[PDB]
Amino acid sequence: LSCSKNNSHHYIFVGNNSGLELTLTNTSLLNHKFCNLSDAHKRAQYDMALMSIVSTFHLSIPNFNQYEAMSCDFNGDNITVQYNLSHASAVDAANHCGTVANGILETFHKFFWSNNIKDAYQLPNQGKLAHCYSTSYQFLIIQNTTWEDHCTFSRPTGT
Ligand SMILES: *[C@@H]1O[C@H](CO)[C@@H](O)[C@H](O)[C@H]1NC(C)=O
Ligand SMILES: *[C@@H]1O[C@H](CO)[C@@H](O)[C@H](O)[C@H]1NC(C)=O
Ligand SMILES: *[C@@H]1O[C@H](CO)[C@@H](O)[C@H](O)[C@H]1NC(C)=O
Ligand SMILES: *[C@@H]1O[C@H](CO)[C@@H](O)[C@H](O)[C@H]1NC(C)=O
Ligand SMILES: *[C@@H]1O[C@H](CO)[C@@H](O)[C@H](O)[C@H]1NC(C)=O
């Protein structure tokens, strides 16, 4: 379940009956390291998902040429994105500051959706103060799912 006491979670409405469930968790959903966006249609569903999060959360992601370890999978049109977060220490957070995952951590922290996030490091970048968040959560999961089902993980791939 996304809505478990050992998790932290939030739902974003994006469509008419669609949205994104965001879950900080220690349960891995995707146990492969790849994210196959060879399909231009899948590339488009991936970009739209990340775009909805950035715009809904008014994120400004600093450009540190950094990257969050990540995999994805599709169940029909439903996307699953998993980040394997490198945010355990203040220095890990700093080295993973310019990522969408960090901006999501920033948002969970800002709105008290988790007690397990710290603003661990700040640094000037292009005239703005970037904040880099540490968390003990190992994974951040993004799934396209409905409000009615947002508390239950969807199956990452079909059968
Ligand atoms: C998740 O795992 C990390 C790393 O082992 C641990 O420090 C943390 O307490 C765990 N969080 C929960 C909610 O179990
Ligand atoms: C979190 O709690 C749920 C429900 O008790 C359990 O199924 C799950 O295994 C727990 N998470 C981890 C990482 O053990
Ligand atoms: C994330 O961690 C899981 C479990 O440790 C692993 O199976 C998976 O390959 C990892 N994914 C990435 C993108 O590193
Ligand atoms: C979520 O899935 C529905 C179909 O299940 C799809 O129409 C919609 O575009 C998806 N949302 C995205 C990709 O943001
Ligand atoms: C995808 O998600 C939609 C709602 O988000 C759901 O109705 C559907 O059963 C899911 N799976 C597939 C294969 O479309």
Residue numbers in the entry: 82 to 240
What do the authors of the reporting publication say about this deposited model?
We solved the crystal structures of the GP1 glycoproteins from Loei River virus (LORV), an Asiatic rodent-borne OW arenavirus of unknown pathogenicity in humans, and Whitewater Arroyo virus (WWAV), an NW arenavirus associated with spillover into human populations in North America. Both WWAV and LORV GP1s were solved at neutral pH (7.5 to 8.0) and acidic pH (5.6 to 5.0), permitting the first direct analysis of the effect of pH on the structure of GP1 in the absence of cognate GP2.
LORV GP1 crystals were generated under both neutral (pH 8.0) and acidic (pH 5.0) conditions, and X-ray diffraction data were collected to 2.5- and 2.0-Å resolution, respectively. Neutral- and acidic-pH-derived LORV GP1 structures were solved by molecular replacement, using the crystal structure of GP2-free LASV GP1 as a search model. Structural overlay analysis revealed that the two LORV GP1 structures are highly similar (0.7-Å RMSD), indicating that pH does not modulate the conformation of isolated GP1. In contrast to the structural differences observed between WWAV GP1 and other NW arenaviral GP1 glycoproteins, LORV GP1 exhibits a high level of structural conservation with other OW arenaviral GP1 glycoproteins in GP2-free states, where superimposition of LORV GP1 with LASV GP1 and Morogoro virus (MORV) GP1 resulted in a remarkably low overall RMSD (approximately 0.8 Å and 0.7 Å, respectively). In contrast to WWAV GP1, however, the structure of LORV GP1 is distinct from that likely presented on the trimeric GPC and equivalent to previously reported acidic pH structures of LASV GP1 (16) and MORV GP1 (17) in GP2-free states, which present α-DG-incompetent binding surfaces. We note that residues known to interact with α-DG in LASV GP1 are fully conserved in LORV GP1, indicative of shared receptor usage. For example, in contrast to the close spatial association of critical binding residues (H141, N146, F147, and Y150) in the GP2-associated state of LASV GP1, H139 from LORV GP1 is displaced by more than 15 Å from the nearest other predicted binding site residue (N144). Similar to previous structural analyses of LASV GP1 and MORV GP1 (16, 17), the spatial delocalization of these receptor-binding residues in LORV GP1 is consistent with the structure constituting an α-DG binding-incompetent conformation formed following detachment from GP2 during host cell entry.
